[PDB]
């Protein structure tokens, strides 16, 4: 006979949350990744200096002169950050993150410019030789959709 204004408006806010659910869920993940990136960076300094001073990429965190323990460079969504031959990889925690990005990671690596180096940011990579890396193809890479426009670099970017 009457009461449908309360019933529909409680059911439009319910469906509004369902529509606002995936937007906040990738905005959210995309936000948790933007930090893995900040934790990865700032460690470029150590790595850059080590390379320019010696001409060899730092083998591990201790070589680069950073928390000798990967797990000591963690965060809220970051379970750690390891330096492996100049390549700095950031791992996403398992608690406090999206759902399709946890335990997932990215990498920052550089290239000899000769007198200086240039840095790249993208999906996990392994270093082959002092001037070549390759996709750490294995299945734990953070999905392209969660990576900034500034971190879409490919293993062979120059």
């Amino acid at each position: 006979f009457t009461l449908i204004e309360l019933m529909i408006v409680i059911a439009i806010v319910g469906i509004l949350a369902a529509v606002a659910l995936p937007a906040y869920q990738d905005y959210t993940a995309r936000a948790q990744v933007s930090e893995a990136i900040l934790l990865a960076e700032g460690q470029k300094s150590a790595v850059t200096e080590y390379y320019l001073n010696h001409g060899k990429w730092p083998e591990n965190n201790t070589s680069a002169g950073v928390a000798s323990s990967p797990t000591d460079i963690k965060g809220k969504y970051v379970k750690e950050v390891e330096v492996k031959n100049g390549v700095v990889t950031a791992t996403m925690l398992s608690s406090g993150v999206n759902n399709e990005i946890k335990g997932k990671k990215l990498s920052l690596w550089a290239r000899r410019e000769n007198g200086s180096v240039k840095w790249f940011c993208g999906q996990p990579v392994t270093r082959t030789d002092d001037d070549t890396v390759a996709d750490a193809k294995d299945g734990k890479e953070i999905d392209t959709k969660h990576l900034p426009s500034t971190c879409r670099d490919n293993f062979d970017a120059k």
Partner: protein, 35 residues
């Protein structure tokens, strides 16, 4: 309970660098419709 006769199998380690265990597997299996 259906006619999926699996035959020639293969699998290998899907990770280039080999940094974690993972096996991609390709199995061939066939059923036999009428002519």
């Amino acid at each position: 309970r259906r006619i999926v006769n699996v035959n020639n199998i293969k699998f290998d380690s899907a990770k280039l660098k080999n940094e974690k265990v993972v096996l991609q597997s390709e199995f061939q299996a066939t059923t036999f419709r009428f002519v």
